[PDB]
């Protein structure tokens, strides 16, 4: 149940990735912007429903206390290994057991907003242990641990 | 579960960035 200042600050960094205008709320527009950048394309109705899963007070946006409630609960309720397994399935779009190096580079470039090309190159090179141009599940586990 | 997992996955990528910067 314990939540350190550092853990809260890390969850705030996740919040601000979506709240790109820094107004303290995540809107359907901001959510859609991130999801589309990663190759998803939800309808406006789907985006509203997604906001509604997190929006505890029903005003149509996610504020940080709502975001933190949801993220701390997910961390508490999920074993660290399942958290990583789930994330791998998120980024393995085809479901073929691999994330291509190009796909991972795109995810990192969009989610690490200040990263340079050289930085993402090092990360990819380190991630793809066997050098086959894919990141498999065992390699993804090595990344996250 | 799907919505929560998508938010959590982006936090986990940011956690990787922190871990990588430490290594
Ligand atoms: Ca905002
Ligand atoms: Ca709200
Ligand atoms: Ca590989």
Q: Which two tokens stand for residue A45?
A: 């109705």
Environment class of residue B13 by beta-carbon count within 10 Å: exposed (0-12), middle (13-18) or buried (19+)? Answer: buried
Kindly report the three-state secondary structure assignment for every residue of chain A.
CCCCHHHHHHHHHHHHHHCCCCCCEECHHHHHHHHHHCCCCCCHHHHHHHHHHHCCCCCCCEEHHHHHHHHHHHHHHCCHHHHHHHHHHHHCCCCCCEEEHHHHHHHHHHHCCCCCHHHHHHHHHHHCCCCCCEEEHHHHHHHHC
CA distance B12 to A134: 19
Residue in chain A lying closest to B8 (CA): A71
Which resolution in angstroms does this entry have? Answer: 2.0
Q: Which of A34, A50, A83 sits opposite B8 (nearest CB)?
A: A83
Closest by Cα among A130, A140, A35 to A84: A140
Looking up tokens 């579960």 gives: B1
Distances (CA, A) of A109 to A27, A98, A106: 22, 18, 5
Instruction: Tell me the residues surrounding ligand 3 (ion) with CB < 5 Å.
Output: A 128, 130, 132, 134
- C-alpha distance from A144 to closest chain B C-alpha (Å): 6
CB atoms A144 and B12 under 8 Å: yes
Q: Residue B7: in which H helix or E strand, if any? A: helix B2-22
CB A22 within 8 A of CB B23: no
- C-alpha distance from A15 to closest chain B C-alpha (Å): 9
CB A21 within 8 A of CB B21: no
CA of A10 to the centre of ligand 3 (A): 29
Backbone dihedral angles phi then psi of residue A135, each to the nearest 5 degrees? -115, 115
CB B20 within 8 A of CB A123: yes
Beta strands A98-100 and A134-136, pairing class: antiparallel
CA distance B3 to A71: 11
CB atoms A53 and B16 under 8 Å: no
CA distance A32 to A142: 30
Backbone dihedral angles phi then psi of residue A96, each to the nearest 5 degrees? -95, 10
CB A136 within 8 A of CB B4: no
Q: Which two tokens stand for residue A92?
A: 């393995």
- C-alpha distance from B16 to closest chain A C-alpha (Å): 6
**DSSP for residue B11:** H
Fold of A5-77: Recoverin; domain 1 (1.10.238)
């Amino acid at each position: 149940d314990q939540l350190t200042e550092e853990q809260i600050a890390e969850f705030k960094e996740a919040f601000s990735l979506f709240d790109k205008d820094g107004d303290g709320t995540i809107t359907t527009k901001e959510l859609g912007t991130v999801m589309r950048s990663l190759g998803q394309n939800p309808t406006e109705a789907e985006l509203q429903d997604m906001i509604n899963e997190v929006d505890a007070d029903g005003n149509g946006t996610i504020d940080f206390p709502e975001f933190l409630t949801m993220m701390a609960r997910k961390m508490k309720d999920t074993d660290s290994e399942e958290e990583i397994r789930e994330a791998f399935r998120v980024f393995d779009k085809v479901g073929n057991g691999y994330i291509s190096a190009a796909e991972l580079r795109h995810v990192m470039t969009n989610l690490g907003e200040k990263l340079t090309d050289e930085e993402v190159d090092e990360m990819i090179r380190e991630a793809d242990i066997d050098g086959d141009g894919q990141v498999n599940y065992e390699e993804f586990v090595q990344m996250m641990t | 579960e799907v919505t929560v997992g998508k938010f959590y996955a982006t936090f986990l990528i940011q956690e990787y960035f922190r871990k990588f910067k430490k290594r």
